[PDB]
Design a binder for this molecule. Structure first.
Ligand code: 7KM
Ligand code: CL
Ligand code: NA
Ligand code: ZN
Length: 264
């Protein structure tokens, strides 16, 4: 059988996809995951015992972002291999296209948590190649179901671009995108580009945002805001055009004052 349900934190979550946990774990109907160290367990009793023993109350690695109770940890897959493998196995339950789970050393992982008196509770993550020949600033990106469509995914997208800006580079998420990921990027790109235009060339926008010119152009095309002239895309916008594609949920926001981070 496959794993079809997990318990993590105070949540029970149904699986969306196969994930290659060991077949004894895989063969269990339901796995129990420590929300802090991501150990996966077969039984309610081993889970309860672990909860009393585990000393971790947050992800490992460097806390590279903290604003109020919103935290991002940067975890090197070479330095916390087991944790990152466990994270990839969790993620694969909700990602069709992810293929990499155990060979985590080439990646850095950015773990989003929401903190309270008990600890830092995992919401989602994105992985990123330490070296990306293709200029991908996100490899895989996943928000756990109870947190989806609540602003956390937008925060991670914005975060991934704040890192690209700090690296003085453009970047794009690796394809294929999940169905929820594609909707979210398009919405993020639209909002960011429109907010800027309302407040410019395609190249200007790319330098300001670290969004690739390709993603800028495809977004503007869906907004019907580019013309084509002798082989070149060119922005074509007016206020009624801009301001009527913006006219609601206040985002979490990435406050670059609260980001502790320099390029590798
Ligand atoms: N809505 N978006 C998300 O929650 C979200 C979800 C996922 C994802 C989860 C599980 C499996 C596959 C994908 C991926 C991304 C990138 C994502 F954003 S939202 O956070 O409220 C939002 C995002 C962007 C613009 C507006 C709202
Ligand atoms: Cl569920
Ligand atoms: Na018993
Ligand atoms: Zn634990």
């Amino acid at each position: 059988k496959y794993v079809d349900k997990i318990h993590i934190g105070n949540y029970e979550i149904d699986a969306w996809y196969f994930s290659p946990f060991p077949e004894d774990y895989g063969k269990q109907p339901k796995l129990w995951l420590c929300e802090y160290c991501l150990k996966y367990m077969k039984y309610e009793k081993s889970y309860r015992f672990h909860l009393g023993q585990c000393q971790w109350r947050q992800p490992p690695g460097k806390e590279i972002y903290r604003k109020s109770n919103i935290s991002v940890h940067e975890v090197d897959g070479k330095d916390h291999k087991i944790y990152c493998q466990n994270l990839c196995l969790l993620a694969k339950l909700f990602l069709d296209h992810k293929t990499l789970y155990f060979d985590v050393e080439p990646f850095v992982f950015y773990i989003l948590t929401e903190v309270d008196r008990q600890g830092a509770h995992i919401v989602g993550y994105f992985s990123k190649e330490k070296e990306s020949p293709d200029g991908n600033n996100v490899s895989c990106i996943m928000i756990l179901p109870p947190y989806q469509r609540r602003g956390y995914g937008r925060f991670l997208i914005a975060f991934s671009y704040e890192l690209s800006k700090l690296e003085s580079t453009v970047g794009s998420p690796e394809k294929p995108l999940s169905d929820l990921g594609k909707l979210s990027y398009r919405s993020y790109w639209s909002s960011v580009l429109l907010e800027n235009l309302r407040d410019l060339s395609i190249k200007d926008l790319s330098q300001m945002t670290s969004i690739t010119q390709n993603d800028i152009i495809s977004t503007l095309q869906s907004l019907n805001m580019v013309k084509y002239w002798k082989g070149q895309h060119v922005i074509c916008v007016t206020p009624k055009l801009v301001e009527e594609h913006l006219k609601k949920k206040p985002p979490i926001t990435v406050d670059s004052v609260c980001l502790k981070w320099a390029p590798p």
